[PDB]
């Protein structure tokens, strides 16, 4: 269900096919009317705390959303552990994959699923793990 995804999450691993954050805060997902989602997080890049607020608009395809006014498409895929999910972002023109989990602790089996996902989508395996912090 959509409501299940609401609440706090941690950005645990990132990769791009083609601005590495030196620090990331937890991510909050809020379920808006109509099944749409709001994603809020803060990132420290170049010594500056930059807030990031995204609206993911539900589409006719489940687990598929659009953001930046249709400029980007975002897919949300589960893993074998109930509290970790894969976000796959594509559009304007780069690709990005993120592992998100409900806790910030290292998780081997979610990481194994993430690497398998990266292989199926043709990313490399040079994964980046941002440093975690409650406040920016
Ligand atoms: Zn957990
Ligand atoms: Zn495994
Ligand atoms: Zn294992």
TrEMBL record:
Superkingdom to which the source organism belongs: Eukaryota
Binding residues for Zn(2+) 2: 108-109, 112
Keywords of the record: Metal-binding, Secreted, Signal, Zinc
Residues passing through the membrane, by range: none
List of residues binding Zn(2+) 1: 83, 103
Protein's UniProt name: Fel d 7 allergen
Domain Lipocalin/cytosolic fatty-acid binding intervals: 6-130
Cysteines paired by S-S bonds: 49-136
Keyword set includes Secreted: yes
Compartmental location: Secreted
């Amino acid at each position: 269900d959509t409501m299940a995804m609401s609440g706090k999450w941690y950005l645990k691993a990132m990769i791009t096919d083609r601005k590495k954050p030196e620090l990331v805060t937890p991510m909050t997902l809020t379920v808006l009317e109509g099944g749409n989602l709001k994603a809020e997080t803060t990132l420290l890049t170049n010594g500056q705390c930059k807030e990031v607020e995204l609206i993911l608009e539900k589409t006719s395809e489940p687990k598929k959303y659009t953001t930046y006014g249709g400029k980007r498409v975002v897919y949300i895929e589960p893993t074998e552990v109930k509290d970790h999910y894969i976000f796959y972002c594509e559009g304007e023109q780069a690709r990005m994959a993120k592992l998100v989990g409900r806790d910030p602790e290292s998780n081997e089996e979610a990481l194994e699923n993430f690497r398998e996902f990266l292989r199926a989508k043709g990313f490399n395996q040079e994964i980046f793990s941002p440093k975690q912090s409650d406040t920016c």
